[PDB]
Every structure is written in C-alpha cells, then in structure tokens.
C-alpha cells in the first residue's frame, strides 16, 4: 500500500545506493541472492519490505530502484557484485559516454538520447505499485551527470505525474576540498532545477563527514566507503516509520508540511547521533538527554556551516529504539531554556517528535557500534546561506575571466543562462535573510 521509488543517478548515487540497499536488506533479513529465509519467511511483512522491495513468484524479492548512469564502469561493479541476483537486469541502465563534468553533455548532447528508456522503466514500476508516496533521487552537484541528467530527468517526472513528493539527496561541494575545475559552474547551473521541482532537498558536505569519522569514530583516514555507510543511516531512519511500527509515526507526506513555512525555503540539514566506537560505548552511558545535546552541537552537524551564526526555523526529531515520550518532553524543554540555541520569533513551537520501536541495525564490519538509541535531526536554519555564499564567490571569480565557458557553450549552453542562474541563486539568499528578519 505504502510504496516508494528510489532513483540513483551518477557514480556517487550508485555508490551510495549500493551501501544503502545493503543496509535495507539486513534490516528486513533478505539475503543478497533475493530469497527471504525461514527466519522471516514473509511473516508480518505487509509493509516491512513492500515499501522498498516487491514480491515476485516465490522466494524472490526485487527492489524498486532504477540505476541510470552515463558510464558502464560503475554499473559493471553492481552487475558483478554479490547483489547482482537481487537487482533486475533491466532496472540497471548504463550509458556509452559520461558527461565529462559538463552540465550540457548530460542535458542536451547525451541526456535526451537515453532518457527515453529511463522513462519507460519508471512507468513500468509505477503501474505495479498501488499507492506511491513519492520518489527518492540521489546525485551530486559537482558531477556533470548528477547535474545535467538529474535536471532533465526531474523536469520530465513533474510533467508526467506532478502530484507526488520528490525528495532529493545531494552532495554539496566542499568549501576547500575539491577534485574538479568546473565544480562552481556545475553546482550553480543545477540550483534552479532543485528549487523549482524538488519539495525538499537534504544537503551534506564531505568535509563534515570526514571530521565526524576522524574524531567521533576514531579513524585515522576515512574512506568514501565509510562515508556512504553513514549516509545510509539517516535515509534508513527517515523511512523507518513507514516500514516499522511505533508509538508516534511520521509519514513521508508530513516532512514537508512540518519543515517548510514557505515554498522557496526547502533546504534543511541532517544530523545523526550518537556516533561512537565499541570501545567508547563501554565507557559512555547513552541517555535520551545526552543524544539530544549532541544533535544540537555544531561539531556533530553534517554541514560545515555554523548553526550558531544563524537561527532555527523548523526542527524535526526522530527517535528509534527504546524511547519513552516522557524523556523526550523533558529533554526538549531544557533545549528551549538554553540561550545559545536561538529560535525564530514567529515560530513558538518548532519541535516534532517521532518514536519508532525498531532499534538501529549495525552492519557487520562497520565502524558504528551497537547502541540502543538513535536520534535523527532534520532542522531548517538560515545558516545554510553561508555555504551557498562560498560557492557563489568562486563562480563570480571564474565567470569574470570566462574560463572553461567555451566548453559549456560548445555543447549547447549560452551565456544568458549563467547570468540567470546567478540572479536566481542570489534571490534565494536574499529571501532566506528576508524571512529571518525579526519583527
């Protein structure tokens, strides 16, 4: 009944999707081959896996995910890995040539040639489901495929259905760490399509996750694989209420109405706590109040921006495990008393509480320790504007000299859109500060 469709585009999207789907299968008990063992044997799984997977024949489950990318090398790993049997061959869509870090290549040069096959696959999955809660898209702003193909695909989805939520998980370019020379161009060009179509976009920065894994998890050198393992936990916790029972449940259609006060302000952040190792777990006593304090700590946040500079507008609190409502009420009361955390004047109540019975599941071989409680924080703040300000400054310096602009122009871009993107991006920052102005 409650069903969702996840779409992964780009090398980053597939890599994160591979880690996320591994977590999803283990939470339900599905083996990598796709057969449900006698431990679960489709017992009480009306919504446990129907929301993510689908039942085909007997002793076989297929996920409702579409893997589309412009290069076959990343898709080859999935088709060669252990989870090849679990996925359907037609769902995994490959390509001939990548976007080569060019927004136009994934939009005009190559995007429309292969987008026809992607649309049919989504339609086939949609007909199988009865009630579609929404869509999930994973991509990266810096990548050309994650900025060009995603922009074109998202527009077509709104044309077809135009009535279902489309949550977006994107990786924002780091203020200092970079591996490309056209990141400001790609990042700016995709801001308009995210604001126009996506109802809620969660932004993460690789630098922040690196520090969390280095310090909190005590890792000398974090890797990309370890980063993806953390990312799956927020996504699993976000959709935990849809698949598992609990005292207070929040559905996918309640995130938007309780987070965005205006259609333009739809860029919240994410925070996960507690994140500790097994050794630290024995010497630390986890409590409801302790985890809540960690979530509000700027150090533990997943965004390089400092929340204390800005103000909080809307906050969400999702609890998993043995969590009682009484402890949460006392914990949130102390947060409001603290002077350091500032709330918007016109928002008297900005706390949403959700409790799930299912405790977090620890994947074997992961650095995460077994903890009976976990809190997922989805807060909308005006401090996110600083991150946008950094990338905007870099774009102005590059656009002034018009370096590498001819690369975009050759594939079909025009200088007018670049100026329009800056105007649209500047309006978003101005509107963010305008709403933050007090009475």
């Amino acid at each position: 009944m409650r069903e969702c469709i996840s779409i992964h585009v780009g090398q980053a999207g597939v890599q994160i999707g591979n880690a996320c789907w591994e977590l999803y299968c283990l939470e339900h008990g599905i083996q990598p081959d796709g057969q449900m063992p006698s431990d679960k044997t489709i017992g009480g799984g009306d919504d446990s896996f129907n929301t993510f997977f689908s039942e085909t024949g007997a002793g076989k489950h297929v996920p409702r995910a579409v893997f589309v990318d412009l290069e076959p090398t990343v898709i080859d790993e999935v088709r060669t890995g252990t989870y090849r049997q679990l996925f359907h061959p037609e769902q995994l869509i490959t390509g001939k040539e990548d976007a080569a870090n060019n927004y136009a290549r994934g939009h005009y040069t190559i995007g429309k040639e292969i987008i026809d096959l992607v649309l049919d696959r989504i339609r086939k999955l949609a007909d199988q489901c009865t009630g579609l809660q929404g869509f999930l898209v994973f991509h990266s702003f810096g990548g050309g495929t994650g900025s060009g193909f995603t922009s074109l695909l998202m527009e077509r989805l709104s044309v077809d259905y135009g009535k279902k939520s489309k949550l977006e998980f994107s990786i924002y370019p780091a203020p200092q760490v970079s591996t490309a020379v056209v990141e400001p161009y790609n990042s700016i060009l995709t801001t308009h399509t995210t604001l126009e179509h996506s109802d809620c976009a969660f932004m993460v920065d690789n630098e922040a996750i690196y520090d969390i894994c280095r310090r909190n998890l005590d890792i000398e050198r974090p890797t990309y694989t370890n980063l993806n393992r953390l990312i799956g936990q927020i996504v699993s916790s976000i959709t935990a209420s849809l698949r598992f029972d609990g005292a207070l449940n929040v559905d996918l259609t309640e995130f938007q109405t309780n987070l965005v006060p205006y259609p333009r302000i739809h860029f919240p952040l994410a925070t996960y706590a507690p994140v500790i190792s097994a050794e630290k777990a024995y010497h630390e006593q986890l409590s409801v109040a302790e985890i809540t304090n960690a979530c509000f700590e700027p150090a533990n946040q997943m965004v390089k921006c400092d929340p204390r500079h800005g103000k909080y507008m809307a906050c969400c609190l999702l609890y998993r495990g043995d969590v009682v409502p009484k402890d949460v009420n006392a914990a949130i009361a102390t947060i409001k008393t603290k002077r350091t955390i500032q709330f918007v004047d016109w928002c008297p109540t900005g706390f949403k509480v959700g409790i799930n019975y299912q405790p977090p599941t620890v994947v074997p071989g992961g650095d995460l320790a077994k903890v009976q409680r976990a809190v997922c924080m989805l807060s909308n703040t005006t401090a996110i504007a600083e991150a946008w300000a950094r990338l905007d400054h870099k774009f102005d310096l590059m656009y002034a000299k018009r370096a590498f602009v001819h690369w975009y122009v050759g594939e079909g871009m025009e200088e007018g859109e670049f100026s329009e993107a800056r105007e649209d991006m500047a309006a978003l920052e101005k509107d963010y500060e305008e709403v933050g102005v007090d009475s």
């Binding site: 109405t257 009484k326 009361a333 016109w346 706390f351």
Partner: protein, 428 residues
C-alpha cells in the same frame, strides 16, 4: 431503554476509546470473546445502553472507529479486547490527514464522511430510545480535529434534539509535539461552541502532573493516561447503568451545569488517587474524598481554578454512604470557599449517589466543574495563533486545500468572544 452511541476519531480517540471499553467490559463482567461471566443480575439489567445483544449470548459494542489511516485500526484489532468490536464498524482511510485540519474537513473527510454516516445512521433504528452521542478526538491533530468536527455537524442536523458529548483533549502550553497545534485547535473551537451541549477538556500536561505527584509513578505511559480518562467517563454515566438513591442522567446533569448555551466547557476530576505505599495509611470517608476533589492538584486541566469563581459544580458519588454526611461536606466547602464560588446563584453543587461502587474500591466520586478559569487555556492558544498568522506561516499548506484567509479570522474572532463572556460574568 436509554442507549448511547460512541464514536472514535483519530489516533488519540482510538487509543482512549479502546481503553474505555475495557473498563466498561470489566464493570459489566464481559469477557473479551463476548460472553457474560458476571455474578450479579444488575450487570445485565442495563447492559443495552452500551452493548447490543446478539445470538449465542454474544454482545457487540455500539461503537464506531473512524480514522484516515489503517495503522491505528490494525493495532486496535490485534490488541486486547479487539475482536469484541463488530468488523463492519471498522471504516478507515488510506491517504491520511498529515496533521492538517483542512484535509480532514474538506479534502479527505468528504470522501469518507458518507461511508461513516451509513454506520451511525443504521444503529439508530435498532436503538429503542437513543439519548445522545459521545465522540473522542484530539484538537491538536488533523484527523480527529478536522474530520471528527465535520461528523458533529452532520449528526446535529439529522438529530437536533439529542445531547452531544465530546471527551476531547486540548493542546498543552509547554508540551507540544506538533508545529501546527494552534491552527488546528482554533479552527475546531468555532464549530464545537455551536453544535455541542457539553465539552470536557483534557490536558496531557495536567495528567502527567497527577501521575508524578498524586500517584508517585516512576515512569508514565500513554495507557496510564488513558486509564484516568476512561475512569472519568464511567463515573459520568453510572446512573444510567446502575440504580441509586438519587439518580441523575446526562440530561439531568446538563441542565444543572450550563446556565447559558454558550458556556458549556467543564473540567473533569476523579478521586481518590493514592500510591501503593500510602494505601494502608489513608482512610475511606466522605470528607477524605471531598478534600481531594476540590484540590487544584487533582484537576485534569492545566487551568488553576483558584484564579476564578466556580459557576456550577457537579458531583456523582458511587458506593454506600449516608446522605447526611455528603449533604454537609459540599455545603461546608461552599461556605468556607465563599470567594471561590459565584454569588448570584445560592447553590452551585449538584449531588448524585450511585449504589454500585467501582471495582476494587469501596467508595469513589467524579468531580465536574464549570469554573471561569477555563478562559486562560483559550487565551494562550490565541497568542500562538496570532503570532504565526502575523507572518502568514504555514498558511499556504492550509490554503492549498481550498481554505480562505478570511475563514481563519472568523475563528479567531469567535474565540475572543468566548473568553469575553466567561470573564464578563466572572467579573460581574
């Protein structure tokens, strides 16, 4: 003879209503399957008020469960005393309200209101002489506050001569798990003040205080809070189910409670409530129960009655006690607390005595008070509503469902008038 139709709306109403039927079944000695296993003839004498007799000595409740989500119904069906309810009484939606009043009343409720109107209509012809309807819903939610309010108007038009009861909770001042609580609460008071004869206010913050100090419980539970509400529900209609020296039904209590049609908001209360350790030290006398009933700590609402004058007070006694003792206790309370009661009414106390005591208790009493301090609860809701309406916060979500800005203003104006009338007579 006289029967009552029960309606459950929203997640809060379903959970509270489920616990309410457990108390009634225990009082009437009905096993979960539906067979009578009692040891008294009085239990079956007036069992038709809440249970409909069926074949093979089986009884089904006259209750209807209404919600826009199937999750709540599945838990109730699989829970204790779940198979007792009639399967045809399970009417549920598939989309949900999402804590939105507009969706429940306009967008989603209209599709399902017709289906639930069939079930409630069908019970009436089977009913010999219906007395009224009691509905449980939460004002802070979207389903119970939104769609449940619409059901009140539909029943009122069909039956404009029957009393309407609404055992509903209200948003707490400090406790708040939703962002749009003031928007939903304000839009529900406008309809309740017109199509309801008596309203009972329940505060979650007040319930926690009772379970912390009065009961000395270590950890509270939502089931524990629902047990207090169900206990108050049983004590209100004990006269209609069991005989007594002085009987008073809902209509008899209603006329003595409301001096004016608009002033129909009451605060409930139950006594005695003691911890396990203090059970062996307290005594069971009428003065002991009277002191707890007239205590601010025992009130089920966040409002403190000491800040206003009591207009009318309703007290129903359960058990065996002398009429002389109960007559003096309420008279002494009024005489001592002269400044705490209204002046232009000589007597503000209604006394009812029920012979049958509650299970596991020699004596008990339920306190109902129409105090003038209830306007403070509406005052704090108005401040929250004005602050968010000034910045037009979250108004587009409500507007997208077909609502208008002027409709919100009308609800605010009506709420301001309600607190003016309560203050006018109090300060008269």
């Amino acid at each position: 003879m006289r029967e009552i139709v029960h309606i459950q709306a929203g997640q809060c109403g379903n959970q509270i209503g489920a616990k309410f039927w457990e108390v009634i079944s225990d009082e009437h000695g009905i096993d979960p399957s539906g067979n009578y296993v009692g040891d008294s003839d009085l239990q079956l004498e007036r069992i038709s008020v809440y249970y409909n007799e069926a074949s093979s000595h089986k009884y089904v409740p006259r209750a209807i469960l209404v919600d826009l989500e199937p999750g709540t119904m599945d838990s109730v069906r699989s829970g204790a005393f779940g198979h007792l309810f009639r399967p045809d009484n399970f009417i549920f939606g598939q989309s949900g309200a999402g804590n939105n009043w507009a969706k429940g009343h306009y967008t989603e409720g209209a599709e399902l209101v017709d289906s639930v109107l069939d079930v409630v209509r069908k019970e009436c012809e089977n009913c010999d002489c219906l007395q009224g309807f009691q509905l449980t819903h939460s004002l802070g939610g979207g389903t119970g506050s939104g769609m449940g309010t619409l059901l009140i108007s539909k029943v009122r038009e069909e039956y404009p001569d029957r009393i309407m009861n609404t055992f509903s909770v209200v948003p707490s001042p400090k406790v708040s798990d939703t962002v749009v609580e003031p928007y939903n609460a304000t839009l529900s008071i406008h309809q309740l003040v017109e199509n309801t004869d008596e309203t009972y206010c329940i505060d979650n913050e007040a319930l926690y205080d009772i379970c912390f100090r009065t009961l000395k419980l270590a950890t509270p539970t939502y089931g524990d809070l629902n047990h207090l509400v169900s206990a108050t529900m049983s004590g209100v209609t004990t006269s209609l189910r069991f005989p007594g020296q002085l009987n008073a039904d809902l209509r008899k209590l209603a006329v003595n409670m409301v001096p004016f049609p608009r002033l129909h908001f009451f605060m409930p209360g139950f006594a005695p409530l003691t911890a396990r350790g203090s059970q062996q030290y307290r005594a069971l006398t009428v003065p002991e129960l009277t002191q707890q009933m007239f205590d601010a700590k025992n009130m089920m609402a966040a409002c403190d009655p000491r800040h206003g004058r009591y207009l009318t007070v309703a007290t129903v006694f359960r058990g065996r006690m002398s009429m002389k003792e109960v007559d003096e206790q309420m008279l002494a309370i009024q005489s001592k607390n002269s400044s705490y009661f209204v002046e232009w009414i000589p007597n503000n106390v209604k006394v009812a005595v029920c012979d049958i005591p509650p299970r596991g208790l020699k004596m008990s009493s339920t306190f109902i008070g129409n105090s003038t301090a209830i306007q403070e609860l509406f005052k704090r809701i108005s401040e929250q509503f004005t602050a968010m309406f000034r910045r037009k916060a979250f108004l587009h979500w409500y507007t997208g469902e077909g609502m208008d800005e002027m409709e919100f203003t009308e609800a605010e104006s009506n709420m301001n008038d309600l607190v003016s009338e309560y203050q006018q007579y109090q300060d008269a």
